[PDB]
Structure formats: C-alpha cells, structure tokens
C-alpha cells in the first residue's frame, strides 16, 4: 500500500493496525485478528510491551510468513519501550525481551512509549504505600542515546517517540552529538483533537505524526469519561459518511491521510478490519477537510489526570 519515507530512508505504511485490547479480551484474539488484518492488507502493525500481546502478534506474523502470505520485509512491526525502562542500561534489554517474545530478529520501529518516567522495575505500574504511582527522574536524552544504540545494533530499523510535545521533541532535536532524529511522534489525534500546531512543527523537522485513537478510542469507562462526545457519532462526520457512501470511521481515517498523518486503526472485528483498508478507495474534498478541521475541541479521550503532577506531563504546553 501507500508508504511515507522516514527521515531515516526507511518506509512506513501510512495505514497501521492497532493491536491493543483490554485485559478482559483473551490473548488468543490478538493472534486471530492480526492474521485477519494481514489477510485484509494491513502491513503496518502497532504493538508494545505494555499491551501484553507481542507474543501473539509475533505468532500471527510468523504464521502469515510461513503460509507464504507475506515476507518479513513486507511487514512493518513497531514496539514501544515502557516508562519503567527509561534508564539507559534498561533500554536494549527491554528491546531484546520484546524481540524474544515476538520471536523476531528486529522491530521496524521502536518508540519511547511516553516521556513520563516511572520507577524502574518489572512491574509496569509501580505504586507507593499510599497507592500512588511512583515517578522516576531520567534525562530522556540519555534514553534516546540508548535508543540510537539499538538502531546501530540492528535491533530496530527505526526509532521514534510517542506522546511527546514540542518542547520534549526539541530536547532531542537539540541534543549535542545527536545521531538519529526521531522518525515519528505517535500521539492521540482525531477530529476532536487534530494536533494541527504539533503537526506543522513535526513537518518542519521531517518527523512523521502517527495518530492513535484516530477513531475516537475504545472508550473504556475506566479511563474515558462516558460524557465525552462519541467521535463516530459526530453529525459532521456522519454527514460526510452518507455523502461519500462510506462510514464515519473511514472519514476520520481519510482525514488524517490527506493532511499527511499516518493513521492507526484498531479493530478486533473481521468485517471492520476489512472495511478499514478501504480508506484508500475514496478522497475527501478540500471543503470536506476544512469542515472536519473545525471540529477540534482539544479533547483527549484518555484520562491522564493522575499524571498531571509528573514533570514530563506533556499536556501542560499549548502543544
Ligand atoms: N502510544 C500510545 O500512547 C498509544 C498508542 N495506541 C495504539 O494506537 C491504536 C489506537 O487505537 P485505539 O485508541 O485503541 O482505538 P481506535 O480509536 O483505533 O479505535 C476505534 C474503535 O472503533 C471501532 N472500529 C474500528 N474500525 C471501525 C469501523 N470501520 N467502524 C466503526 N467502528 C470501528 C473498534 O472497535 P472493534 O474492535 O469493535 O471494531 C475500536 O475499538 C491502539 O490499538 C494502539 O496500537 C493507542 C493508545 C495510546
Ligand atoms: C498519559 C497517558 O499514557 C498512556 O496511558 C497510561 C496508562 O495506560 C493503561 O493501559 C491501558 C491502555 C493503553 C495505554 C497505552 C497504550 O499505548 C495503549 O494502546 C493502551 O488502554 C486501555 C484501553 C481500554 O479500552 C481499557 C483499558 O483498561 C486500557 C488500559 O488499562 C495502564 O493500565 C495505566 O496504568 C497507565 O497509566 C496513553 O498514552 C494515554 O493515551 C495517555 O493519555
């Protein structure tokens, strides 16, 4: 499918498959749907250590390779370094563990999952005696130096960041002796939070903005306010769907593609997985795009209020 050339020289498919499913979903499902996604045409697959599914996603990939559906070089697999492994010496070992889990020799993209460092350890969510998550203080530039070492070691073809604001990205870009710029910044991006300012900045530095929750999130009552507006039920998106004879999801996805944003799309439903690849079958008019541009309400679906006190909380800046 369509790809975008990274400041790396490497290529990333502009459409990616989101693999996160809540803990209640059996892990066998991740294996099943990833195969369905590859069969549908998805070549870009987004995972992470935190998802507790890299083994299943890797198994699916190995399966589609074995049956001759695809070759490893045809698949773009990404993993993410969790915040409890920000200390430089824990980076490569974290990547190696993901590689071992997924039964892969390398990941096409490794990202620092979030700039908000947490206390080092196996536990992904460390909390103190009063039930509060334990933060850690780490110079992300040293974490980045460790990431660069992983790319030089061939373990990651490309390296990037996730959930970084302009200031945090600049910290890396301005780091003395910088070897590799992040190829991307994966952030929450959709019509209710389009990130136009950050997008423009990223474009100026040749960094790709990858959109997550591009379809409005999974809206789990544990992290998403039920009163928050349902994206796929937006009057404007629905109007454009009926006009183009597509669906609101396809409209939201096409919007990103036309503004130069790589879009992720999660679905554990075979029919919807197959529908999502149809985003390349139609185009939105310039007027359609302006209409969607006006939907922005700076709405972040995930309730990150508990991290508001973190020195690296990214949402303090205007962008
Ligand atoms: N780095 C980071 O901080 C983060 C990264 N991510 C990554 O990006 C992805 C972002 O997606 P996420 O927030 O999970 O969810 P999305 O916003 O992609 O979810 C869309 C939701 O809509 C449904 N859906 C999918 N296709 C359609 C369709 N055609 N029509 C109607 N409904 C549809 C899905 O449900 P159903 O399964 O029932 O189809 C899915 O739950 C994740 O899976 C993950 O890989 C996500 C959050 C944070
Ligand atoms: C600051 C926050 O950091 C990240 O969430 C951090 C939280 O993730 C939670 O991990 C979860 C994630 C998640 C997180 C990151 C991802 O990349 C991702 O794809 C998914 O997604 C869910 C989606 C659901 O529908 C239901 C859920 O219970 C969870 C969930 O617990 C952990 O359980 C918490 O302990 C942790 O603090 C995300 O980037 C989020 O969008 C951002 O706002």
Asked if 64 and 94 touch (Cβ cutoff 8 Å), the reply is no
**Total number of domains constituting the chain:** 1
What six digits make up the tokens of 233? Answer: 């039920």
Least Cα distance to 134 among 144, 145, 126 occurs for 126
Residue span of the structural domain in which 100 resides: 1-319
The CA distance from 302 to 223, in Å, is 5
Q: Would you call 39 helix, strand, or coil by DSSP?
A: helix
Bridge partners (DSSP) listed for residue 265: 17
Asked if 210 and 187 touch (Cβ cutoff 8 Å), the reply is yes
CB of 265 sitting under 6 A from ligand 1: yes
Stated in angstroms to one decimal place, the resolution of this structure is 1.7
Closest ligand (CA of 302): 2
Phi first, then psi, for residue 290 (nearest 5°) are: -60, -40
CB of 48 sitting under 6 A from ligand 2: yes
The CA distance from 189 to 253, in Å, is 10
Q: How far is the CA of 213 from the centre of ligand 1 (A)?
A: 5
Query: Three-state SS across 181-240?
Result: CCCEEEEECECCECCHHHHHHHHHCCCEEEEECCCCCCCCCCCCCCCCCCHHHCHHHHHH
The CA distance from 127 to 206, in Å, is 38
Phi first, then psi, for residue 258 (nearest 5°) are: -75, -15
Other residues' Cβ atoms within 10 Å of the Cβ of residue 158: 24
Q: How far is the CA of 215 from the centre of ligand 1 (A)?
A: 6
Q: What is the CATH number of the domain that holds 205?
A: 3.20.20.100
Strand bridging mode 11-13 / 3-5:
antiparallel
**Rg of the chain in Å (alpha carbons):** 19
């Amino acid at each position: 499918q369509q790809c975008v050339k990274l400041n790396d020289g490497h290529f990333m498919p502009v459409l990616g498959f989101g693999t996160y499913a809540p803990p209640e979903v059996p892990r066998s499902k991740a294996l099943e749907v990833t195969k369905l996604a590859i069969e549908a045409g998805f070549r870009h697959i987004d995972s992470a250590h935190l998802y507790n599914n890299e083994e299943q996603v890797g198994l699916a990939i190995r399966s589609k390779i074995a049956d001759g559906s695809v070759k490893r070089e045809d698949i773009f697999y990404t993993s993410k370094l969790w915040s409890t492994f920000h200390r430089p010496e824990l980076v490569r070992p974290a990547l190696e563990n993901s590689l071992k889990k997924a039964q892969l020799d390398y990941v096409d993209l490794y990202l620092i999952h979030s700039p908000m460092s947490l206390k080092p350890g196996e536990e992904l969510s460390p909390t103190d005696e009063n039930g509060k998550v334990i933060f850690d203080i780490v110079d992300l530039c040293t974490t980045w130096e460790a990431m660069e070492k992983c790319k030089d070691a061939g373990l990651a073809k490309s390296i990037g960041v996730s959930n970084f604001n302009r200031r945090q990205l600049e910290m890396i870009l301005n780091k003395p002796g910088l070897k590799y710029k992040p190829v991307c910044n994966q952030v929450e991006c959709h019509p209710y939070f389009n990130r136009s300012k950050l997008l423009d900045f990223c474009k100026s530095k040749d960094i790709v903005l990858v959109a997550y929750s591009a379809l409005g999130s999974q809206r789990d009552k544990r992290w998403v306010d039920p009163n928050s507006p349902v994206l796929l039920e937006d009057p404007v998106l629905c109007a454009l769907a009926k006009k183009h004879k597509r669906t609101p999801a396809l409209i939201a996805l096409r919007y990103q593609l036309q503004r130069g944003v790589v879009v992720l799309a999660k679905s554990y439903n075979e029919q919807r997985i197959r529908q999502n690849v149809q985003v390349f079958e139609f185009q939105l008019t310039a007027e359609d795009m302006k209409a969607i541009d006006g939907l922005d309400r700076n709405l972040h679906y995930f309730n990150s209020d508990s991290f508001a006190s973190h020195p690296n909380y990214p949402y303090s800046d205007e962008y």
